[PDB]
Symmetry: D2
């Protein structure tokens, strides 16, 4: 289970660089240099990294420090062969974003958020990123009178429409991916699920510029089936990027390594990405627990990749198994994939076997044989075949 | 706080007619006649009722019993002046729908579901209904291999496209409203939130035929902010109908009367429907607890209407209050409603006050004054002004 | 992975006998005869069965039908060698229990509940049961004024104290196990977790007669760590019996087969029962999904036992693995098991290395190496060692 | 609705002193001096304050700075007449506590935690505190192999037994209150609910020294009924102190001001504390949102007290209302408070009206009239009587 840079494994700077500050505790780990992380992640088998603006260039940097940071960074990528497939803006840490970036009630703030975002889009394009993610972690409210959601969705649409105008006036090949989250650190966050972010995109002036960046633990914080939401994003053609991690149910966002948390969901997610042939980065947006030293950091980033690769092999052996393929026909998966009425409306309406002479008791009596199927999936995931 | 039939209050037959069967218990109440419920609901001040096919006509009825039921029903509406604004199909109770209706793996089942739905659309139109709701409570799965969600979303789109072809070939004025629910009675239900149902609609052949029917307690079963989801539905123009009830957090669907459950959410929902000017039915989809006799039933349906009308008055007094209007300007709600950059992209880009000379420390220092605002809302809801 | 009747696998009659009625659907399966279930469960390898009164003898039975049912039953146990380790009362289905059994506001109801319970205790003892479970599924409320919880806990204590007086005046060897559940079918259920049921027991007149019956999916409906709650029950000496099943997070109680749901929790539960040497029944309180026919029923009851036995083997190989034992010392599990201050208070107070000369920076710097440990557990569960 | 220092309103230093650092954001507010907070809280009507060791004396302080801090503090209490009813240890912020304090796997850490706690017990007693709270926010785990819960509960019992030995060897009048929390900042926290903390206390050597400190939002993070858990703590005699705040359902701990969150729960909690006659501090453990400046801080701490006092008046008018008292008899609350069988076991057993001649159909038919009751409670909370 050794990754190679063909597995398309990526990591944010902020992930292995998390110092372990939490709502109740001080950092437990020193700040990593981005160049160290690039070299360490390359040795483990990763294929590239991603960044916020403010991961790479310290907030308030001059234009001469700005360039020094970027040049160092760039030398590390050239030295290791790592890519930068995705980049993003920090519109959540600084106190100025305490009411949001693109939806902050103060108009001057919303203009400043767009200017900070456009400056980093130019950087991203310079460093080769194909996808530009937007996670509006500060867009929301703790109380009902603080935010008119209609106005806020006008502002959000306005900001994303300007960014699409900017990208298409520069000639950039870059797409946008909106990342939903239902809460945390706002009481409630706007566009809180994949379905809200898909819907929203269909109102933008150029919807084809925008897809979604769903993260495992964000839909699971709403108690939702992550594989189900990713199947919808795939069905809409809008799975532009994906964040992988683990989460134990509806509580704070834990950001555990990928394969911790809900292990059977992780199996069914891998099964789906691989059989749909998703070809983007497999990006890990996780935090090594603050119990760990830098050894535990690199163990935890390794086990992300390892659990992906074990669950790919188990999903591949599940679908390849003739007994599974027989059970899938027993459960009528083959029939699900056929049109209901490709004969058309009229034929349907004149078809006496569809109503007047349908035997609803004989149909009701047929067993779906799902439990046998699911125990086959269980025996495959567990290697107990 | 007396309703009148101008308040537009409606109730399903199944709501006050719930006999109190639950996963662990037998009915506690005898079956009501639909004509009794119409007469009792009329006396309480309601403006109409809604029905499943199988509420009104017993599953398997001949065509001579079918008509007898409808004629009785119709005489009660003529006698009381109640309307039927909304109608819907039962594609969940019968054992034939145990794997779904429009997404059942068996193709014969999916054809039978569409035929049962079209027969009731003709009825609905006969009885004056404007909105036809679809709650696919059986569309989903308990295990990951049982349902391919891509195929299932093809089937669901196929069924809704046929229904739109049928309605527009009959000349019917009727629209469809999809009602999302995240789980229960399936493990996971397809289109589990308002945002998933909005997104889905944008893929149908005629999207303008379809909106959403959101229900209070369904988004709250995912831990989501119901007023936020309804603001999005309003922003998309797709709030066709609404189900009102209460729910205490993330657990089984309780269907408590409206104003029980999350009382401050109920306040902010009323505030929003009334200030957006939603003009559909205020429909109560609730179950009187099985602790109650028929006296407790009619008390519980009354208290729905009463709590709506109290919370309308409190929301109206909140928005009318000059001190509230001052606080809303203190918190910059007025600025949220202004465009971020109606000056356009270029101007934004050349505006030095938006970046190069933006004072981010002075902006960060400004307080949003949300807590004062929210305590004003609290004092108004509580009558402690 | 073949059970034998030495594995101590048991099943309720109500589990494989669930007809598939749910809040929204009719039965999908015919009623099983208890004698059939005994013979089928014996062939699969089970070691015994459990029952409600009203599983075995139809509510309202004469005393001549009562005995006929029991005699049939008994002949099936003699024919198969199945035991009856546990028995329990139905104080939830009948409408008379709509406000509870032992805590129903009506005093006549609470007297009737105790009389129905004592009659079945005599039966249980006749059929050899060692443990008598009490799940008060109707003890609770949907609204705050309906139940005074202090009075209700007086009534509950009163009922359990009478039952202990009855058992000890008959000379019976039988113990009681209280089964907690946080909600469903009441809004909120009294003693909603293992910790509330442990606490409660410490107020009964004879606490040594009472332990707990925790069920997987009940603590998981509160988002709680089931292995953690069972470790507490073990630490208190009060794990009298255990209900095993699966549950996908905080929602309705699904009762999935054991190993579905939260698979890593299932691993850590098996690890704990086996290394603590729990010696009671491994009882499966689950419902085969209503998608299934009787073939899917027996598949689902088989896969309970199979997943137990796979997860026992994986836990045994985890703890036996020298590299695991090394990692457990790396993470200082060995130190957790040592007293903090067996030197006593005074010595602690005079120990300068415990405060005045404790180097808190060197201690803070030590990594706990938990992630390496947890990936070892992952590789063992997955057979990817 | 003006507090006075007779209302017994208290606040932690850390509450109004929260600088607004969150998992994703920097402080938004400067650090308050404890003496300023004492003077500001006194003007608002509060009756005292509480503290962690490290709120009042900066971690690592000399013994000459230590005393300077305490003397300043003390002068502010003498100047304002504020009390210090409760004090507590910080065993969560420093990196040394990253695996816990009393349950940390490292034995040297667990000795250091006890020494830091005992030093602050002496301080507390000096400043008049009656209650000493222990919130073990770091006692738990993110993964199953990291913590053996049995060993950890031995360590926890050992630490609390030493603290009780210390207090009773010094002659101190001080009691301990354990505060449960189910998660955050650990994956899972040990003793995660009131019921687990009650149970645990019954194993300590001197249980009468220990009660519970429950907090609103902590039980609500498990989806539990906070008034129900406090009724149990009251029934056990172990409600030593209480933390008041608001929380919107199962998610991160929001710490909203008291009366935000679940407003009907807040009503029923006030009803219960007041009618049980709880006489401890009404302590607010809340965080003013980081959207606020210091004006919004003092608004938010004011609205805590105000919403308590409004909900006390509404609960008092509910219980005083003859129509309510009539409804409570209609719903048989009076009967709940009577013994079930004060006639004893034998009489119960010979009572033919309790079984052989009980009419279970007539009892089942009686309505509980809970919905009428609950709408009366609604009309009272809303002032719509
Ligand atoms: O919840 C935090 C969120 O997952 C964050 O890591 C975003 O993904 C990042 O800001 C954009 O990539
Ligand atoms: O959860 C049940 C659901 O709310 C149901 O009542 C639908 O609304 C009805 O089938 C369509 O109107
Ligand atoms: O939630 C249902 C509960 O699990 C029930 O099956 C009990 O365990 C049974 O009544 C007592 O054994
Ligand atoms: O969740 C944080 C917790 O509520 C904390 O504020 C404790 O109450 C304090 O450490 C002891 O008083
Ligand atoms: Mn992410
Ligand atoms: Mn509904
Ligand atoms: Mn059970
Ligand atoms: Mn607290």
């Amino acid at each position: 289970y050794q990754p190679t840079p063909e597995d398309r494994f990526t990591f944010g700077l902020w992930t292995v660089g998390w110092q372990g500050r939490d709502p109740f505790g001080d950092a437990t780990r020193r700040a990593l240099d981005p160049v160290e992380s690039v070299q360490r992640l390359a040795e483990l088998g990763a294929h590239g990294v991603t960044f916020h603006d403010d991961d790479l260039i310290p907030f308030g940097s001059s234009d001469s420090e700005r360039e020094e940071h970027v040049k160092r960074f760039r030398q590390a990528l050239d030295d290791t062969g790592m890519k930068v497939p995705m980049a993003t803006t920090n519109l959540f840490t600084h106190p100025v974003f305490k009411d949001g970036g693109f939806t902050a009630n103060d108009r001057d703030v919303r203009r400043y958020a767009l200017r900070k975002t456009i400056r980093n889009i130019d950087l991203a394009v310079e460093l080769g990123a194909e996808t530009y993610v937007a996670w509006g972690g500060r867009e929301g409210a703790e109380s009902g009178g603080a935010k008119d959601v209609r106005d806020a969705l006008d502002r959000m649409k306005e900001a994303f429409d300007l960014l699409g105008e900017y990208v298409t006036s520069q000639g950039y090949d870059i797409r946008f991916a909106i990342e939903p989250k239902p809460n945390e650190p706002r009481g409630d966050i706007l566009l809180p699920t994949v379905g809200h972010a898909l819907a929203f995109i269909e109102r933008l002036e150029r919807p084809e510029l925008y897809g979604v960046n769903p993260e495992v633990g964000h839909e699971q914080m709403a108690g939702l089936n992550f594989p189900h939401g990713i199947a919808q994003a795939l069905w809409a053609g809008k799975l532009f990027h994906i964040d992988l991690n683990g989460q134990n149910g509806i509580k704070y966002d834990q950001d555990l390594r990928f394969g911790a948390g809900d292990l059977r969901a992780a199996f069914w997610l891998v099964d789906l990405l691989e059989s749909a042939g998703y070809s983007g980065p497999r990006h890990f947006d996780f935090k090594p627990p603050r119990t760990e030293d830098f050894d535990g950091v690199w163990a935890s980033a390794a086990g992300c990749m390892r659990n992906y690769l074990i669950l790919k092999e188990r999903a591949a052996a599940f679908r390849a198994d003739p007994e599974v393929q027989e059970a899938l026909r027993a459960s009528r998966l083959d029939e699900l994939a056929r049109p209901t009425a490709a004969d058309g409306l009229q034929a349907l309406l004149d078809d006496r076997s569809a109503f007047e002479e349908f035997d609803v008791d004989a149909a009701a009596a047929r067993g779906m044989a799902f439990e046998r199927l699911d125990q086959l999936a269980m025996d495959h995931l567990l290697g107990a075949r």
